[PDB]
Amino acid sequence: EXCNXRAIEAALDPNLNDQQFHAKIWXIIXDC
Amino acid sequence: EXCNXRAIEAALDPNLNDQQFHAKIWXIIXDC
Amino acid sequence: EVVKFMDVYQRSYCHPIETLVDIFQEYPDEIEYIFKPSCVPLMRCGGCCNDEGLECVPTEESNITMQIMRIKPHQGQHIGEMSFLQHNKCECRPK
Amino acid sequence: VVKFMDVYQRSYCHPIETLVDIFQEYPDEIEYIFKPSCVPLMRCGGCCNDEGLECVPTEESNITMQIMRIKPHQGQHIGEMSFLQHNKCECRP
Protein backbone atom coordinates (compact mmCIF):
# COMPACT_ATOMS: atom_id res chain seq x y z
CA GLU A 1 0.00 0.00 0.00
CA UNK A 2 1.91 3.54 2.81
CA CYS A 3 4.27 0.66 3.05
CA ASN A 4 4.99 0.29 -0.72
CA UNK A 5 4.85 4.88 -0.31
CA ARG A 6 7.82 4.43 2.06
CA ALA A 7 9.58 1.84 -0.06
CA ILE A 8 9.30 3.96 -3.18
CA GLU A 9 10.37 7.24 -1.56
CA ALA A 10 13.38 5.42 -0.04
CA ALA A 11 14.36 4.20 -3.47
CA LEU A 12 14.20 7.62 -5.10
CA ASP A 13 16.71 9.21 -2.75
CA PRO A 14 19.74 10.00 -4.93
CA ASN A 15 21.88 11.10 -1.96
CA LEU A 16 21.76 7.56 -0.53
CA ASN A 17 23.79 4.50 -1.51
CA ASP A 18 22.79 0.90 -2.21
CA GLN A 19 23.54 -0.38 1.32
CA GLN A 20 22.07 2.53 3.22
CA PHE A 21 18.90 2.45 1.11
CA HIS A 22 18.99 -1.35 1.53
CA ALA A 23 18.81 -0.93 5.28
CA LYS A 24 16.08 1.71 5.01
CA ILE A 25 13.67 -0.46 3.05
CA TRP A 26 14.38 -3.79 4.72
CA UNK A 27 12.69 -1.14 8.25
CA ILE A 28 9.94 -0.96 5.97
CA ILE A 29 9.79 -4.69 5.24
CA UNK A 30 11.15 -5.42 9.69
CA ASP A 31 7.94 -3.57 10.21
CA CYS A 32 5.31 -3.51 7.43
CA GLU B 1 4.47 -46.05 1.29
CA UNK B 2 1.80 -48.81 -1.52
CA CYS B 3 1.82 -45.91 -3.95
CA ASN B 4 5.62 -45.42 -3.86
CA UNK B 5 5.61 -49.94 -3.96
CA ARG B 6 3.97 -49.54 -7.36
CA ALA B 7 6.16 -46.60 -8.39
CA ILE B 8 9.41 -48.40 -7.65
CA GLU B 9 8.24 -51.76 -9.06
CA ALA B 10 7.19 -50.15 -12.34
CA ALA B 11 10.58 -48.42 -12.65
CA LEU B 12 12.49 -51.70 -12.25
CA ASP B 13 10.80 -53.31 -15.25
CA PRO B 14 13.56 -53.92 -17.78
CA ASN B 15 11.24 -54.89 -20.67
CA LEU B 16 9.54 -51.44 -20.73
CA ASN B 17 10.53 -48.25 -22.55
CA ASP B 18 10.92 -44.62 -21.44
CA GLN B 19 7.43 -43.55 -22.59
CA GLN B 20 5.58 -46.70 -21.47
CA PHE B 21 7.25 -46.69 -18.05
CA HIS B 22 6.44 -42.97 -17.91
CA ALA B 23 2.77 -43.66 -18.45
CA LYS B 24 2.77 -46.38 -15.75
CA ILE B 25 4.11 -44.09 -12.98
CA TRP B 26 1.97 -41.21 -14.02
CA UNK B 27 -1.43 -44.32 -13.71
CA ILE B 28 0.05 -44.24 -10.28
CA ILE B 29 0.44 -40.46 -10.15
CA UNK B 30 -4.02 -41.36 -11.97
CA ASP B 31 -4.28 -42.35 -8.35
CA CYS B 32 -1.98 -40.87 -5.72
CA GLU C 1 13.90 -38.82 6.57
CA VAL C 2 14.42 -39.91 2.91
CA VAL C 3 12.17 -38.59 0.13
CA LYS C 4 10.38 -41.33 -1.84
CA PHE C 5 11.02 -41.94 -5.54
CA MET C 6 7.49 -41.08 -6.66
CA ASP C 7 7.57 -37.67 -4.96
CA VAL C 8 10.99 -36.88 -6.36
CA TYR C 9 9.70 -37.80 -9.83
CA GLN C 10 6.51 -35.78 -9.56
CA ARG C 11 8.20 -32.70 -8.09
CA SER C 12 11.05 -32.65 -10.55
CA TYR C 13 8.89 -33.55 -13.59
CA CYS C 14 8.44 -30.80 -16.23
CA HIS C 15 6.38 -27.84 -15.00
CA PRO C 16 6.28 -24.07 -14.45
CA ILE C 17 8.36 -23.11 -11.42
CA GLU C 18 9.35 -19.76 -9.83
CA THR C 19 12.66 -18.67 -11.33
CA LEU C 20 14.74 -15.61 -10.50
CA VAL C 21 15.83 -14.05 -13.79
CA ASP C 22 18.21 -11.12 -14.29
CA ILE C 23 16.41 -8.22 -15.94
CA PHE C 24 19.36 -7.74 -18.26
CA GLN C 25 18.63 -11.23 -19.65
CA GLU C 26 15.02 -10.28 -20.46
CA TYR C 27 16.32 -7.03 -22.02
CA PRO C 28 19.75 -7.66 -23.58
CA ASP C 29 19.38 -4.50 -25.65
CA GLU C 30 19.59 -0.95 -24.30
CA ILE C 31 21.56 -1.42 -21.04
CA GLU C 32 21.83 2.37 -20.61
CA TYR C 33 19.91 2.14 -17.30
CA ILE C 34 20.44 -0.12 -14.24
CA PHE C 35 17.71 -2.13 -12.50
CA LYS C 36 16.80 -2.47 -8.80
CA PRO C 37 16.23 -5.28 -8.11
CA SER C 38 18.78 -6.65 -10.57
CA CYS C 39 16.68 -9.86 -10.79
CA VAL C 40 12.92 -10.58 -10.68
CA PRO C 41 10.80 -13.69 -9.89
CA LEU C 42 9.18 -15.26 -12.92
CA MET C 43 7.41 -18.50 -13.64
CA ARG C 44 9.44 -20.44 -16.13
CA CYS C 45 9.73 -23.98 -17.42
CA GLY C 46 11.79 -26.26 -15.26
CA GLY C 47 12.24 -29.99 -14.80
CA CYS C 48 12.90 -32.93 -17.04
CA CYS C 49 10.87 -34.80 -19.66
CA ASN C 50 12.75 -37.96 -18.65
CA ASP C 51 13.10 -38.82 -22.31
CA GLU C 52 16.00 -38.47 -24.77
CA GLY C 53 13.95 -37.09 -27.65
CA LEU C 54 11.86 -34.64 -25.66
CA GLU C 55 12.56 -31.11 -24.52
CA CYS C 56 10.35 -29.01 -22.21
CA VAL C 57 8.63 -25.96 -23.72
CA PRO C 58 5.97 -23.50 -22.57
CA THR C 59 2.64 -24.04 -24.30
CA GLU C 60 0.62 -21.25 -22.61
CA GLU C 61 2.18 -17.92 -21.45
CA SER C 62 1.16 -14.57 -19.92
CA ASN C 63 2.52 -11.18 -18.98
CA ILE C 64 3.31 -9.99 -15.38
CA THR C 65 3.95 -6.35 -14.35
CA MET C 66 6.35 -5.15 -11.66
CA GLN C 67 7.54 -1.91 -10.08
CA ILE C 68 11.25 -1.58 -10.68
CA MET C 69 13.80 1.16 -10.27
CA ARG C 70 15.46 2.11 -13.54
CA ILE C 71 18.69 3.97 -12.71
CA LYS C 72 21.07 5.92 -14.96
CA PRO C 73 24.29 6.34 -12.89
CA HIS C 74 24.99 10.05 -12.16
CA GLN C 75 22.15 10.86 -14.57
CA GLY C 76 19.40 10.06 -12.02
CA GLN C 77 17.03 7.25 -10.98
CA HIS C 78 13.30 6.89 -11.61
CA ILE C 79 10.73 4.24 -10.73
CA GLY C 80 8.40 2.60 -13.23
CA GLU C 81 6.60 -0.58 -14.24
CA MET C 82 7.94 -3.31 -16.54
CA SER C 83 6.25 -6.39 -18.10
CA PHE C 84 7.85 -9.83 -18.15
CA LEU C 85 6.79 -13.06 -19.79
CA GLN C 86 5.66 -15.86 -17.54
CA HIS C 87 4.83 -19.50 -18.30
CA ASN C 88 1.40 -20.81 -17.30
CA LYS C 89 1.90 -24.24 -18.85
CA CYS C 90 4.72 -26.48 -19.92
CA GLU C 91 4.89 -29.72 -21.89
CA CYS C 92 7.33 -32.35 -23.09
CA ARG C 93 7.55 -32.22 -26.86
CA PRO C 94 9.94 -33.59 -29.52
CA LYS C 95 12.59 -31.54 -31.37
CA VAL D 1 1.02 -4.83 -10.89
CA VAL D 2 3.30 -6.31 -8.30
CA LYS D 3 4.39 -3.69 -5.79
CA PHE D 4 8.08 -2.72 -5.70
CA MET D 5 8.23 -3.69 -2.05
CA ASP D 6 7.07 -7.24 -2.72
CA VAL D 7 9.37 -7.62 -5.74
CA TYR D 8 12.28 -6.34 -3.68
CA GLN D 9 11.50 -8.59 -0.74
CA ARG D 10 10.70 -11.76 -2.75
CA SER D 11 13.63 -11.42 -5.11
CA TYR D 12 16.21 -10.59 -2.45
CA CYS D 13 18.94 -13.22 -1.88
CA HIS D 14 17.63 -16.43 -0.25
CA PRO D 15 17.39 -20.22 -0.63
CA ILE D 16 14.89 -21.32 -3.35
CA GLU D 17 13.84 -24.60 -4.95
CA THR D 18 16.04 -25.18 -7.96
CA LEU D 19 15.96 -28.12 -10.37
CA VAL D 20 19.56 -29.36 -10.75
CA ASP D 21 21.02 -31.99 -13.10
CA ILE D 22 22.27 -35.04 -11.24
CA PHE D 23 25.07 -35.23 -13.83
CA GLN D 24 26.13 -31.73 -12.87
CA GLU D 25 26.22 -32.76 -9.20
CA TYR D 26 28.05 -35.99 -10.14
CA PRO D 27 30.22 -35.37 -13.20
CA ASP D 28 32.41 -38.33 -12.27
CA GLU D 29 30.09 -40.98 -13.68
CA ILE D 30 28.45 -40.24 -17.02
CA GLU D 31 28.16 -44.00 -17.27
CA TYR D 32 24.74 -44.32 -15.61
CA ILE D 33 21.50 -42.55 -16.42
CA PHE D 34 19.29 -41.18 -13.69
CA LYS D 35 15.51 -41.20 -13.41
CA PRO D 36 14.57 -38.49 -12.77
CA SER D 37 17.53 -36.91 -14.53
CA CYS D 38 17.06 -33.70 -12.52
CA VAL D 39 16.21 -33.14 -8.88
CA PRO D 40 14.72 -30.34 -6.74
CA LEU D 41 17.20 -28.71 -4.33
CA MET D 42 17.08 -25.59 -2.20
CA ARG D 43 19.89 -23.39 -3.48
CA CYS D 44 20.98 -19.76 -3.35
CA GLY D 45 19.00 -17.40 -5.52
CA GLY D 46 18.31 -13.73 -5.98
CA CYS D 47 20.54 -10.73 -6.03
CA CYS D 48 22.36 -8.73 -3.37
CA ASN D 49 21.63 -5.49 -5.29
CA ASP D 50 25.28 -4.36 -4.93
CA GLU D 51 28.16 -4.29 -7.38
CA GLY D 52 30.72 -5.55 -4.89
CA LEU D 53 28.57 -8.16 -3.17
CA GLU D 54 27.85 -11.80 -4.09
CA CYS D 55 25.30 -14.30 -2.67
CA VAL D 56 26.80 -17.34 -0.96
CA PRO D 57 25.34 -20.11 1.12
CA THR D 58 26.15 -19.81 4.81
CA GLU D 59 24.38 -22.91 6.15
CA GLU D 60 24.40 -26.18 4.25
CA SER D 61 22.83 -29.58 4.75
CA ASN D 62 22.39 -32.89 3.05
CA ILE D 63 19.21 -34.37 1.41
CA THR D 64 18.60 -37.97 0.40
CA MET D 65 16.44 -39.15 -2.52
CA GLN D 66 15.35 -42.39 -4.25
CA ILE D 67 16.68 -42.27 -7.77
CA MET D 68 17.01 -44.78 -10.62
CA ARG D 69 20.57 -45.39 -11.78
CA ILE D 70 20.34 -47.03 -15.26
CA LYS D 71 23.19 -48.76 -17.13
CA PRO D 72 22.01 -49.18 -20.77
CA HIS D 73 21.81 -52.88 -21.70
CA GLN D 74 23.71 -53.64 -18.45
CA GLY D 75 20.68 -53.39 -16.14
CA GLN D 76 19.04 -50.80 -13.90
CA HIS D 77 18.77 -50.48 -10.13
CA ILE D 78 17.02 -48.10 -7.70
CA GLY D 79 18.82 -46.52 -4.71
CA GLU D 80 19.41 -43.52 -2.44
CA MET D 81 21.53 -40.45 -3.33
CA SER D 82 22.72 -37.44 -1.20
CA PHE D 83 22.65 -33.89 -2.54
CA LEU D 84 23.76 -30.58 -1.04
CA GLN D 85 21.15 -28.09 0.11
CA HIS D 86 21.46 -24.44 1.26
CA ASN D 87 19.74 -23.61 4.51
CA LYS D 88 20.79 -19.92 4.61
CA CYS D 89 22.27 -17.38 2.22
CA GLU D 90 24.17 -14.14 2.83
CA CYS D 91 25.37 -11.16 0.81
CA ARG D 92 29.12 -10.86 1.22
CA PRO D 93 32.21 -9.31 -0.39
UniProtKB/Swiss-Prot annotation, chain D:
Induction: By hypoxia. Regulated by growth factors, cytokines, gonadotropins, nitric oxide, hypoglycemia and oncogenic mutations. Higher expression in pituitary tumors than the pituitary gland. Glycans are attached at N62. Disulfide bonds join C13-C55, C44-C89, C48-C91. It comes from the Eukaryota. GO terms for molecular function: chemoattractant activity; cytokine activity; extracellular matrix binding; fibronectin binding; growth factor activity; heparin binding; identical protein binding; neuropilin binding. Coiled coil: none annotated. GO terms for cellular component: adherens junction; cell surface; cytoplasm; endoplasmic reticulum; extracellular matrix; extracellular region; extracellular space; Golgi apparatus. Keywords: Angiogenesis, Cytoplasm, Developmental protein, Differentiation, Disulfide bond, Endoplasmic reticulum, Extracellular matrix, Glycoprotein, Golgi apparatus, Growth factor, Heparin-binding, Mitogen, Nucleus, Secreted. It is linked to Microvascular complications of diabetes 1: Pathological conditions that develop in numerous tissues and organs as a consequence of diabetes mellitus. They include diabetic retinopathy, diabetic nephropathy leading to end-stage renal disease, and diabetic neuropathy. Diabetic retinopathy remains the major cause of new-onset blindness among diabetic adults. It is characterized by vascular permeability and increased tissue ischemia and angiogenesis. Belongs to the PDGF/VEGF growth factor family. This is Vascular endothelial growth factor A, long form. It comes from Homo sapiens. The gene is VEGFA. The chain holds residues 220 to 312 of 395 of the full protein.
